Structures are given as C-alpha cells and as structure tokens.
Design a protein around this ligand. Structure first.
Ligand SMILES: c1cc2c(cc1CNC1CCCC1)OCO2
Ligand SMILES: [Cl-]
Ligand SMILES: [Cl-]
Ligand SMILES: [Cl-]
Ligand SMILES: [Mg+2]
Lengths: 142, 137
C-alpha cells in the first residue's frame, strides 16, 4: 500500500519522482480532479488507482491521503483508513476531521476506548461546531 | 518471500525470521546507535524496516539515524509514518519539530511542538516541547 511505498522510498533514500519534479503541480491537480470525477460517479476502483498514483508521487499531501482514506473507509478497510487519517492529521494539525473519521473506524474495529478518545479530542479542540455535534452523538452511544 | 515481494506483504507477515531473533537484531541496532556506530546502526535499522515497515520502533530507529545524519526531511517523512501507525505517541511529532527548525521552517516547527503540548499525555515529552516553544521567536 501507500505507507509501504513511503517507507521503502525512505529506506532506499534514492531519488524519487518528486525529487526530480517529474510531474508538475498543474498536472497533479488535474489527476486529483479526475480521481474525484471517478469517485463521484461510483467508479471507486478507478478512483482508488488514481489516489494510489497520487500518493506514490507525493505521499505527504493531505488532500491525496484523505481521498484514499475515504475510499478505504467506504470499502470497510478500517485499519488502512485509520492509518492514513493519522498521517493526514500529523501533516495538517488544525483539521480534526481525520480524527473524527478515525474514531468511526476504531468503532468498527471493536476498539470503543480508542474511538471515545478520538471523539473527545474533536470536542475539546475542534472549532467546527457541526463536527463536534457529530462526535458527541457517537460518544452518547459508547 | 518472492510472493511477499510480488504481493506487497512484509517478511514479518510470513514469519521469515523468528521473533526472538528479530528482538536481538533490534537490540544490536540500538547497541550500535548508542556506541556511535552510525553506519552500522543505519544498515541494521534499514534491515529492520525492510523486514517490517509497519513496526513503529523500527521506523523510529531509522528516522533517528537520518536525523543524526542531518537528513532532516527524510527523518521528518519517516516520523509522519511513525506517528500515524503508533500508539498515541507524539514523540515523532516532537522530533519532526526539531527537524523543521533545522530546515528553517519555524512556523511548521511551532505547530509540531504545539500539537505535542495539546494532545500528548507524556509529561516529560511535553516539558521538552515547551522548552522549544519558549525559544521560537
Ligand atoms: C490522535 C490522532 C489521530 C487520531 C486519533 C487520535 C486519538 N486517539 C486516542 C487518544 C488517546 C489514545 C486514543 O486519528 C487521526 O490522528
Ligand atoms: Cl476541525
Ligand atoms: Cl533529507
Ligand atoms: Cl515555516
Ligand atoms: Mg472549543
């Protein structure tokens, strides 16, 4: 998966495609919009390939990581999604949506204590009042 | 092994080396590190991360090696993976902040140390993070 690629790239420490600016920003933006065109039409497998492609080229990009994590969550690959949401959070820091979705994933993974901590984190630190209501609704059920 | 290469799995997933032997190799990697045998520690931590990319302590060991060698971006990259995988541990975020300072990105560094202080339950780590924050202009 995308995380394995990132680690192998770091181990080998050779030149990557991004290191040589092999795909310009404007082309990456286009491929990202094509990925969502597929996603929005229900073509989830093609969207997944396009987001994997984006994450091979530029893994440490919140928008690419969040798109892929969403696909994994829909596909009920909850651990893979949670792992990617955590990468997105560590890169973004100020957006608590990846924490909220991780909490959803942890519930499905039968880890309610982890899920509770995720949702409490949202309520304490997010300034998105609507996200906080959603998180509280999950807390009410645990 | 070839199947794991062709199917993306880890060597750990197929129990290619016994558990206690891997423990020994990790200990030897750490011995090299503590003795300043950085070239050998790097080989050993790379070996460990090839064996199990998903092991947070293996990743952290290689990231520390890269940080010592002043490959600050490469260290920061691994620290982001180490965070995402690990068990509510903000230590990789703290070291990312150090890396960002060395990369002349003090606002990114500040956000790292602030994240540690807002969400870590490691009091000693938060003390260190605050000392860096106190110093950031
Ligand atoms: C912190 C960061 C995250 C996250 C979830 C968390 C919070 N976990 C709980 C807090 C105490 C331990 C369990 O999902 C994305 O990134
Ligand atoms: Cl938020
Ligand atoms: Cl580097
Ligand atoms: Cl900066
Ligand atoms: Mg508030």
């Amino acid at each position: 998966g995308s995380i394995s690629t990132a680690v192998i790239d770091a181990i080998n420490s050779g030149a990557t495609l991004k290191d040589i600016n092999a795909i310009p920003d404007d082309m990456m933006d286009d491929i990202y919009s094509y990925a969502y065109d597929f996603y929005n039409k229900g073509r989830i497998e093609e969207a997944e390939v396009f987001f994997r492609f984006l994450c091979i080229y530029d893994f440490y990009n919140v928008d690419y990581i969040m798109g892929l994590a969403a696909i994994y969550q829909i596909k009920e690959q909850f651990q893979q999604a949670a792992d990617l949401y955590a990468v997105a959070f560590a890169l973004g820091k100020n957006d608590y949506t990846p924490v909220f979705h991780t909490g959803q994933c942890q519930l499905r993974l039968k880890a309610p204590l982890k899920a509770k901590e995720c949702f409490e984190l949202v309520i304490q630190h997010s300034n998105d009042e609507k996200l906080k209501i959603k998180a509280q609704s999950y807390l009410d059920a645990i």
